[PDB]
């Protein structure tokens, strides 16, 4: 019935918001559509896997809010295995390498590849994190897909395939589907190409012991009966003195304020009175989520480490179901496993198959990439197709098609009367990640503390001290990386 | 509570479906979200306008189903005024012309222009109406925006600017927003470039006496109390023997089948049990509608006719609020009016102005374009911003961004258990129009008649006799239009001849 704030959605963002309001002395209710909390994080437990992250999993340096929240809740991290060599599989062959991205040996291709990622970072430096529509070339860049940008920029097929794989892996969408402006903002607001792609010293450095689902679960433990499971919100009425929020199971919640902590497009599942203003009414029809099946094959031992492979595979080409993998073995060396993503159009394609059919295809691919018959002998398999989730819409995050971010992007976090907007999509650092979810939940919470007169405006956005446990090292470039010419640049000099 | 078929949506599609099902003996209920039927058609009546269409309005040759439905309901059509000259306004100057598109005198530009719409129609013939994703180059065309297609095809800026305006007018979206495959399909399934753009012998030839809103209102008259206004559907449960459909005002309806006759993305407003299959689940987050404000400025007299202007203006330029107008004078010659569209990014930009400020900007534009100070003397104004409609999502219709139609297109009208899909977006001919609404509504109803064993499979898709009142002149080309080279084709002829 009555409270101070109703939070819609019990993902990390909603939970982080609810925890902050609760800790400040307000009465909060969290309305969650599903029979669980965690949303796009989900940790499955059984005896075969012990625990496995089937959704969001990795955290790394510069993600200081999720690390502080998780540490307070009593969680600890361990490092993803990256002691041995990475593998780039291209044109049916495996090339082992060390470092964040595969070395290029052909000198023309080297120039072209080097220029491409240098250029993504250069372009990013002109895009404000909190307002990408204010980039000097915002409209130009927003009216191009990433496919067009890559066709203009890449002179070699081989750099273009690498760059395409990069886009597919970062945002689980095809290059032709996404705005260039949006994608370039996305990379930049994670701290750039190196930081976004890297395990060591990057976004995939670490996992939580026991799974990331414990973040949402432990906050639920704190809030007790204030969290209502299987309460999908259908109706929010703001015509009266207090805000009225109705659920599908026929309950009514009354509050001074609401935090919407759901993906923007899932706003469509709610009937509003009065209707939303025009820009938000259209925006929420224009912002899909990507497509991904997360797949984990278990083995008796981490047999790849014997061949001096870490388990990371970057896999080129149309025929491979999986483009990217990481070692998902536990810290102790047991429950050996490879984690792989079936991305974008391959997710639509292979979802038709049975679970056993997908396992066979993955095992045969890994046998080829890792060069071991051991890969043909899985002891267990887990997978989740996030495309089929009614209350997520896909994974990892919301992508913006061409034209949308400049026309509608301004309204993402704009309050609608007494509704404030959270969700990772509204963050300005690591938006799309669990880190963004924390930033956005806590920021929306503090917007409401400010509307209530409890805090000054300058405390709505709060900086975060660096994690002592997971410090950031500088991102560096070499002299040659910075000043080698592009392919057209070399041509002009001839 | 109990019936044979619940129809969700009381637009033309829903009402056509419900009418067919009722006439064949079944017990139907229509659940409509709004306090009125008609959806994206809406006829306003007051003493200043008598009546005016603020949404869907025009019908034309080849739209035989809406013409038949309208005629059986006791409606009549009249011709939109195209007696005098059209105007093309570009770079601040007005160029009167006759015929469907502004003729191009600069020969190079002529070749480029000619080639552009010829290539639109050529590519269109590659694309099956009922399965655009089966075109031989479906993938390549779908992975491209219309902006990229026009940048490759137009060797002159003037052709490119005309092509851009064509896309904005047809689908109320920017060239960079829409899939090339989708747009080429959309045009082809309307009968091609000429048919879609034309007043005489095209989509905009006629209007209903009294407004298009009467189609929905008259079917509601025939169905009586079976139509339920202010029943937004929130929940559809298919787990039991009978389908359960729940509304926001707390009513439960129980049926054998459901027709969903709402724009695909407004399917998001419904919670499904069991959950939708993956492909539909994602598809309905990927298919927005366009952006338009429809504006009608009333004048003492249709003063433009006296200058030998019919009232049609094709207006190119960033400063121009309105890109296209038609004469909206009553057939009796009174309530003189100009109907205009504010399209795509201009809808967004100008929505933040007041009604009075928008009227002012339109008048100043019309005055310049028509060369007439009388345009600054309006007697009345009406407008409707469709972008602000919770239960439409925009107008005229749904567009597909790059990559969506090939990946998700095949599930648009794929039934989900005992839910069948209508709405104009699921039609194969004049999808996006009132015609497509009628086609899709009647087809979905007949899918259900087949499921119930009342008709054979070959009667689901039914052809439509040609209107005797609105006969279709065929679309013809001249020899020169068919065989004149493109710009790069001419350049090839030049390089070859000089060797
Ligand atoms: C799915 C996924 C995500 C993911 C990733 C891999 C996959 C396969 N890998 C990641 C990673 O390694 N590291 C990382 O930091 N993030 C990763 N991601 C993304 C990450 O999981 C997400 O950014 C994050 O979990 C998003 O959190 P947020 O709190 O913003 O959103 P959410 O989890 O979707 O929660 C929304 C909740 O709202 C409920 N809901 C939806 N509709 C309603 C209604 N109408 N009423 C009530 N509740 C509603 C949802 O059920 C959900 O719980
Ligand atoms: C908006 C517009 C449309 C239009 C046009 C100009 C404008 C500004 N010009 C046209 C023209 O000149 N000639 C023509 O043939 N078409 C033109 N268009 C398009 C035309 O209006 C539409 O194609 C057509 O009206 C679509 O009919 P359909 O029946 O397919 O779709 P609808 O009208 O949107 O009806 C949907 C109904 O469903 C209700 N609804 C929505 N959600 C719910 C829920 N959850 N529960 C119950 N009911 C729901 C809507 O309220 C609506 O009545
Ligand atoms: C193909 N690419 C080329 C390249 C790109 C940029 C700069 C230099 C070279 C190398 C590369 C290496 C590793 C990656 C991995 O990137 C990600 C990005 C986001 C995630 C996420 C998102 O949360 C989850 C995850 O499990 O793994 C990820 C992995 C991408 C691209
Ligand atoms: C700019 N263009 C150039 C061109 C386009 C194609 C072939 C040759 C030249 C000419 C032109 C002229 C008129 C039009 C008008 O097109 C439409 C399309 C759909 C509608 C619709 C859709 O319902 C409603 C309406 O009131 O007006 C429309 C008007 C478009 C294009
Ligand atoms: C050759 N490609 C790379 C196709 C285009 C160069 C682009 S550009 O000419 O530099 O615009
Ligand atoms: C050289 C001028 C390019 C002309 N445009 C029309 C810009 C591109 C032609 C593309 S294509 O070359 O026909 O593929």
PDB file of C-alpha atoms in Angstrom, chain B residues 61-244:
ATOM      1  CA  UNK B  61      -7.329   3.239 -57.357  1.00  0.00           C
ATOM      2  CA  UNK B  62      -6.251  -0.381 -56.562  1.00  0.00           C
ATOM      3  CA  UNK B  63      -7.502  -0.020 -52.978  1.00  0.00           C
ATOM      4  CA  UNK B  64     -10.573  -2.128 -53.788  1.00  0.00           C
ATOM      5  CA  UNK B  65     -11.172  -3.605 -50.256  1.00  0.00           C
ATOM      6  CA  UNK B  66     -11.512  -0.282 -48.355  1.00  0.00           C
ATOM      7  CA  UNK B  67     -13.664   0.976 -51.284  1.00  0.00           C
ATOM      8  CA  UNK B  68     -15.935  -2.110 -51.045  1.00  0.00           C
ATOM      9  CA  UNK B  69     -16.181  -1.869 -47.240  1.00  0.00           C
ATOM     10  CA  UNK B  70     -16.885   1.862 -47.329  1.00  0.00           C
ATOM     11  CA  UNK B  71     -19.471   1.396 -50.106  1.00  0.00           C
ATOM     12  CA  UNK B  72     -21.361  -1.419 -48.275  1.00  0.00           C
ATOM     13  CA  UNK B  73     -21.487   0.845 -45.186  1.00  0.00           C
ATOM     14  CA  UNK B  74     -23.216   3.555 -47.307  1.00  0.00           C
ATOM     15  CA  UNK B  75     -20.205   5.933 -47.765  1.00  0.00           C
ATOM     16  CA  UNK B  76     -19.231   7.857 -50.910  1.00  0.00           C
ATOM     17  CA  UNK B  77     -15.983   9.351 -52.182  1.00  0.00           C
ATOM     18  CA  UNK B  78     -15.046  12.612 -53.888  1.00  0.00           C
ATOM     19  CA  UNK B  79     -11.896  13.604 -55.792  1.00  0.00           C
ATOM     20  CA  UNK B  80      -9.117  15.674 -54.200  1.00  0.00           C
ATOM     21  CA  UNK B  81      -8.626  18.935 -56.182  1.00  0.00           C
ATOM     22  CA  UNK B  82      -5.862  18.529 -58.795  1.00  0.00           C
ATOM     23  CA  UNK B  83      -7.409  20.690 -61.538  1.00  0.00           C
ATOM     24  CA  UNK B  84      -4.752  23.496 -61.423  1.00  0.00           C
ATOM     25  CA  UNK B  85      -0.946  23.401 -61.163  1.00  0.00           C
ATOM     26  CA  UNK B  86       1.195  21.685 -58.540  1.00  0.00           C
ATOM     27  CA  UNK B  87       4.146  23.580 -56.989  1.00  0.00           C
ATOM     28  CA  UNK B  88       7.658  22.342 -56.323  1.00  0.00           C
ATOM     29  CA  UNK B  89       9.375  24.713 -53.885  1.00  0.00           C
ATOM     30  CA  UNK B  90      13.185  24.290 -53.708  1.00  0.00           C
ATOM     31  CA  UNK B  91      15.956  26.758 -52.598  1.00  0.00           C
ATOM     32  CA  UNK B  92      13.323  29.404 -51.725  1.00  0.00           C
ATOM     33  CA  UNK B  93      11.624  29.483 -55.206  1.00  0.00           C
ATOM     34  CA  UNK B  94       8.392  28.006 -56.518  1.00  0.00           C
ATOM     35  CA  UNK B  95       8.198  26.069 -59.830  1.00  0.00           C
ATOM     36  CA  UNK B  96       4.641  25.208 -60.970  1.00  0.00           C
ATOM     37  CA  UNK B  97       4.161  22.007 -62.934  1.00  0.00           C
ATOM     38  CA  UNK B  98       1.623  19.408 -64.078  1.00  0.00           C
ATOM     39  CA  UNK B  99       1.775  15.606 -63.734  1.00  0.00           C
ATOM     40  CA  UNK B 100       2.813  13.498 -60.721  1.00  0.00           C
ATOM     41  CA  UNK B 101       6.415  14.745 -60.142  1.00  0.00           C
ATOM     42  CA  UNK B 102       8.316  18.006 -60.855  1.00  0.00           C
ATOM     43  CA  UNK B 103       9.881  17.720 -64.332  1.00  0.00           C
ATOM     44  CA  UNK B 104      13.656  18.190 -64.603  1.00  0.00           C
ATOM     45  CA  UNK B 105      15.037  20.289 -67.464  1.00  0.00           C
ATOM     46  CA  UNK B 106      18.814  20.078 -66.907  1.00  0.00           C
ATOM     47  CA  UNK B 107      19.559  16.921 -69.045  1.00  0.00           C
ATOM     48  CA  UNK B 108      22.221  15.368 -66.768  1.00  0.00           C
ATOM     49  CA  UNK B 109      19.923  15.861 -63.808  1.00  0.00           C
ATOM     50  CA  UNK B 110      17.077  14.434 -65.938  1.00  0.00           C
ATOM     51  CA  UNK B 111      19.073  11.163 -66.482  1.00  0.00           C
ATOM     52  CA  UNK B 112      19.948  10.901 -62.823  1.00  0.00           C
ATOM     53  CA  UNK B 113      16.397  11.626 -61.698  1.00  0.00           C
ATOM     54  CA  UNK B 114      14.829   9.240 -64.251  1.00  0.00           C
ATOM     55  CA  UNK B 115      17.271   6.509 -63.269  1.00  0.00           C
ATOM     56  CA  UNK B 116      16.587   6.922 -59.574  1.00  0.00           C
ATOM     57  CA  UNK B 117      12.843   6.130 -59.671  1.00  0.00           C
ATOM     58  CA  UNK B 118      13.330   3.557 -62.454  1.00  0.00           C
ATOM     59  CA  UNK B 119      15.868   1.749 -60.226  1.00  0.00           C
ATOM     60  CA  UNK B 120      13.451   1.972 -57.215  1.00  0.00           C
ATOM     61  CA  UNK B 121      10.825   0.167 -59.322  1.00  0.00           C
ATOM     62  CA  UNK B 122      13.446  -2.262 -60.834  1.00  0.00           C
ATOM     63  CA  UNK B 123      14.697  -3.323 -57.391  1.00  0.00           C
ATOM     64  CA  UNK B 124      11.069  -3.554 -56.211  1.00  0.00           C
ATOM     65  CA  UNK B 125      10.270  -6.247 -58.845  1.00  0.00           C
ATOM     66  CA  UNK B 126      12.965  -8.439 -57.220  1.00  0.00           C
ATOM     67  CA  UNK B 127      11.048  -8.351 -53.895  1.00  0.00           C
ATOM     68  CA  UNK B 128       8.060 -10.689 -53.213  1.00  0.00           C
ATOM     69  CA  UNK B 129       5.109  -8.775 -51.665  1.00  0.00           C
ATOM     70  CA  UNK B 130       4.355 -11.555 -49.190  1.00  0.00           C
ATOM     71  CA  UNK B 131       8.026 -12.320 -48.330  1.00  0.00           C
ATOM     72  CA  UNK B 132      10.432  -9.367 -48.808  1.00  0.00           C
ATOM     73  CA  UNK B 133      13.179 -11.356 -47.039  1.00  0.00           C
ATOM     74  CA  UNK B 134      13.173 -13.769 -50.088  1.00  0.00           C
ATOM     75  CA  UNK B 135      14.526 -11.130 -52.551  1.00  0.00           C
ATOM     76  CA  UNK B 136      17.822 -12.529 -53.987  1.00  0.00           C
ATOM     77  CA  UNK B 137      19.862  -9.669 -52.413  1.00  0.00           C
ATOM     78  CA  UNK B 138      17.614  -9.305 -49.373  1.00  0.00           C
ATOM     79  CA  UNK B 139      20.550  -9.315 -46.951  1.00  0.00           C
ATOM     80  CA  UNK B 140      22.705  -6.695 -48.809  1.00  0.00           C
ATOM     81  CA  UNK B 141      19.690  -4.339 -49.224  1.00  0.00           C
ATOM     82  CA  UNK B 142      18.492  -4.755 -45.628  1.00  0.00           C
ATOM     83  CA  UNK B 143      22.000  -4.009 -44.204  1.00  0.00           C
ATOM     84  CA  UNK B 144      21.793  -0.600 -45.876  1.00  0.00           C
ATOM     85  CA  UNK B 145      19.783   2.541 -44.981  1.00  0.00           C
ATOM     86  CA  UNK B 146      17.887   4.392 -47.663  1.00  0.00           C
ATOM     87  CA  UNK B 147      20.444   7.202 -47.150  1.00  0.00           C
ATOM     88  CA  UNK B 148      23.320   4.887 -48.188  1.00  0.00           C
ATOM     89  CA  UNK B 149      21.286   3.630 -51.178  1.00  0.00           C
ATOM     90  CA  UNK B 150      20.600   7.215 -52.415  1.00  0.00           C
ATOM     91  CA  UNK B 151      24.309   8.243 -51.872  1.00  0.00           C
ATOM     92  CA  UNK B 152      25.274   5.330 -54.266  1.00  0.00           C
ATOM     93  CA  UNK B 153      22.499   5.905 -56.812  1.00  0.00           C
ATOM     94  CA  UNK B 154      22.166   9.692 -57.213  1.00  0.00           C
ATOM     95  CA  UNK B 155      25.048  11.370 -59.128  1.00  0.00           C
ATOM     96  CA  UNK B 156      23.299  14.761 -58.671  1.00  0.00           C
ATOM     97  CA  UNK B 157      22.379  16.554 -55.456  1.00  0.00           C
ATOM     98  CA  UNK B 158      19.074  17.636 -57.007  1.00  0.00           C
ATOM     99  CA  UNK B 159      17.930  14.026 -57.568  1.00  0.00           C
ATOM    100  CA  UNK B 160      19.184  13.094 -54.116  1.00  0.00           C
ATOM    101  CA  UNK B 161      17.114  15.899 -52.520  1.00  0.00           C
ATOM    102  CA  UNK B 162      13.926  14.807 -54.413  1.00  0.00           C
ATOM    103  CA  UNK B 163      14.517  11.140 -53.428  1.00  0.00           C
ATOM    104  CA  UNK B 164      15.020  12.176 -49.785  1.00  0.00           C
ATOM    105  CA  UNK B 165      11.776  14.112 -49.769  1.00  0.00           C
ATOM    106  CA  UNK B 166      10.010  11.103 -51.422  1.00  0.00           C
ATOM    107  CA  UNK B 167      11.095   8.812 -48.541  1.00  0.00           C
ATOM    108  CA  UNK B 168      10.153  11.381 -45.848  1.00  0.00           C
ATOM    109  CA  UNK B 169       6.624  11.803 -47.361  1.00  0.00           C
ATOM    110  CA  UNK B 170       5.963   8.108 -47.898  1.00  0.00           C
ATOM    111  CA  UNK B 171       7.068   6.759 -44.472  1.00  0.00           C
ATOM    112  CA  UNK B 172       7.401   9.849 -42.169  1.00  0.00           C
ATOM    113  CA  UNK B 173      10.995   8.984 -41.355  1.00  0.00           C
ATOM    114  CA  UNK B 174      14.525  10.075 -42.305  1.00  0.00           C
ATOM    115  CA  UNK B 175      16.486   8.233 -45.031  1.00  0.00           C
ATOM    116  CA  UNK B 176      19.154   7.240 -42.462  1.00  0.00           C
ATOM    117  CA  UNK B 177      16.482   5.661 -40.183  1.00  0.00           C
ATOM    118  CA  UNK B 178      14.983   3.131 -42.599  1.00  0.00           C
ATOM    119  CA  UNK B 179      16.158  -0.139 -44.209  1.00  0.00           C
ATOM    120  CA  UNK B 180      16.594   0.024 -48.014  1.00  0.00           C
ATOM    121  CA  UNK B 181      15.028  -3.433 -48.390  1.00  0.00           C
ATOM    122  CA  UNK B 182      12.049  -2.418 -46.297  1.00  0.00           C
ATOM    123  CA  UNK B 183      11.464   0.869 -48.100  1.00  0.00           C
ATOM    124  CA  UNK B 184      11.749  -0.752 -51.584  1.00  0.00           C
ATOM    125  CA  UNK B 185       9.244  -3.429 -50.432  1.00  0.00           C
ATOM    126  CA  UNK B 186       6.899  -0.773 -49.052  1.00  0.00           C
ATOM    127  CA  UNK B 187       6.837   1.101 -52.307  1.00  0.00           C
ATOM    128  CA  UNK B 188       6.493  -2.026 -54.447  1.00  0.00           C
ATOM    129  CA  UNK B 189       3.565  -3.448 -52.375  1.00  0.00           C
ATOM    130  CA  UNK B 190       1.696  -0.171 -53.014  1.00  0.00           C
ATOM    131  CA  UNK B 191       2.097  -0.665 -56.852  1.00  0.00           C
ATOM    132  CA  UNK B 192       5.357   1.380 -57.325  1.00  0.00           C
ATOM    133  CA  UNK B 193       6.615   4.960 -57.251  1.00  0.00           C
ATOM    134  CA  UNK B 194       3.985   6.465 -59.551  1.00  0.00           C
ATOM    135  CA  UNK B 195       1.001   4.896 -57.835  1.00  0.00           C
ATOM    136  CA  UNK B 196       2.245   5.785 -54.333  1.00  0.00           C
ATOM    137  CA  UNK B 197       3.047   9.473 -55.029  1.00  0.00           C
ATOM    138  CA  UNK B 198       0.094  10.309 -57.297  1.00  0.00           C
ATOM    139  CA  UNK B 199      -3.102  12.177 -56.563  1.00  0.00           C
ATOM    140  CA  UNK B 200      -4.867  11.511 -59.899  1.00  0.00           C
ATOM    141  CA  UNK B 201      -4.642   7.726 -60.468  1.00  0.00           C
ATOM    142  CA  UNK B 202      -2.808   7.166 -57.122  1.00  0.00           C
ATOM    143  CA  UNK B 203      -3.050   6.874 -53.319  1.00  0.00           C
ATOM    144  CA  UNK B 204      -4.274  10.437 -52.700  1.00  0.00           C
ATOM    145  CA  UNK B 205      -7.030  10.588 -55.395  1.00  0.00           C
ATOM    146  CA  UNK B 206     -10.094  10.504 -53.145  1.00  0.00           C
ATOM    147  CA  UNK B 207     -11.566  11.133 -49.671  1.00  0.00           C
ATOM    148  CA  UNK B 208     -14.759   9.976 -47.984  1.00  0.00           C
ATOM    149  CA  UNK B 209     -17.707  12.379 -47.805  1.00  0.00           C
ATOM    150  CA  UNK B 210     -18.027  12.949 -44.075  1.00  0.00           C
ATOM    151  CA  UNK B 211     -14.584  11.533 -43.130  1.00  0.00           C
ATOM    152  CA  UNK B 212     -12.860   8.157 -42.928  1.00  0.00           C
ATOM    153  CA  UNK B 213     -13.764   7.850 -39.230  1.00  0.00           C
ATOM    154  CA  UNK B 214     -17.288   6.748 -40.381  1.00  0.00           C
ATOM    155  CA  UNK B 215     -15.891   3.353 -41.493  1.00  0.00           C
ATOM    156  CA  UNK B 216     -15.066   2.369 -37.919  1.00  0.00           C
ATOM    157  CA  UNK B 217     -18.128   4.219 -36.455  1.00  0.00           C
ATOM    158  CA  UNK B 218     -20.594   2.441 -38.860  1.00  0.00           C
ATOM    159  CA  UNK B 219     -19.136  -1.025 -38.143  1.00  0.00           C
ATOM    160  CA  UNK B 220     -19.501  -0.198 -34.403  1.00  0.00           C
ATOM    161  CA  UNK B 221     -23.199   0.700 -35.133  1.00  0.00           C
ATOM    162  CA  UNK B 222     -23.701  -2.791 -36.740  1.00  0.00           C
ATOM    163  CA  UNK B 223     -21.928  -4.674 -33.866  1.00  0.00           C
ATOM    164  CA  UNK B 224     -23.915  -2.807 -31.167  1.00  0.00           C
ATOM    165  CA  UNK B 225     -22.778  -3.486 -27.617  1.00  0.00           C
ATOM    166  CA  UNK B 226     -20.073  -5.993 -28.773  1.00  0.00           C
ATOM    167  CA  UNK B 227     -17.582  -3.063 -28.947  1.00  0.00           C
ATOM    168  CA  UNK B 228     -16.037  -2.113 -25.584  1.00  0.00           C
ATOM    169  CA  UNK B 229     -14.495   1.346 -25.381  1.00  0.00           C
ATOM    170  CA  UNK B 230     -11.881   2.190 -22.657  1.00  0.00           C
ATOM    171  CA  UNK B 231     -10.787  -1.461 -22.425  1.00  0.00           C
ATOM    172  CA  UNK B 232      -6.967  -1.359 -22.918  1.00  0.00           C
ATOM    173  CA  UNK B 233      -5.801  -4.968 -22.965  1.00  0.00           C
ATOM    174  CA  UNK B 234      -2.955  -5.659 -20.468  1.00  0.00           C
ATOM    175  CA  UNK B 235      -2.755  -9.487 -20.318  1.00  0.00           C
ATOM    176  CA  UNK B 236      -3.347 -12.461 -22.579  1.00  0.00           C
ATOM    177  CA  UNK B 237      -3.208 -15.959 -21.036  1.00  0.00           C
ATOM    178  CA  UNK B 238      -3.098 -18.969 -23.344  1.00  0.00           C
ATOM    179  CA  UNK B 239      -2.146 -21.646 -20.713  1.00  0.00           C
ATOM    180  CA  UNK B 240      -5.725 -23.040 -20.362  1.00  0.00           C
ATOM    181  CA  UNK B 241      -8.367 -24.435 -22.780  1.00  0.00           C
ATOM    182  CA  UNK B 242      -9.980 -21.039 -23.451  1.00  0.00           C
ATOM    183  CA  UNK B 243      -7.893 -17.852 -23.995  1.00  0.00           C
ATOM    184  CA  UNK B 244      -8.176 -15.287 -21.212  1.00  0.00           C
TER     185      UNK B 244
END
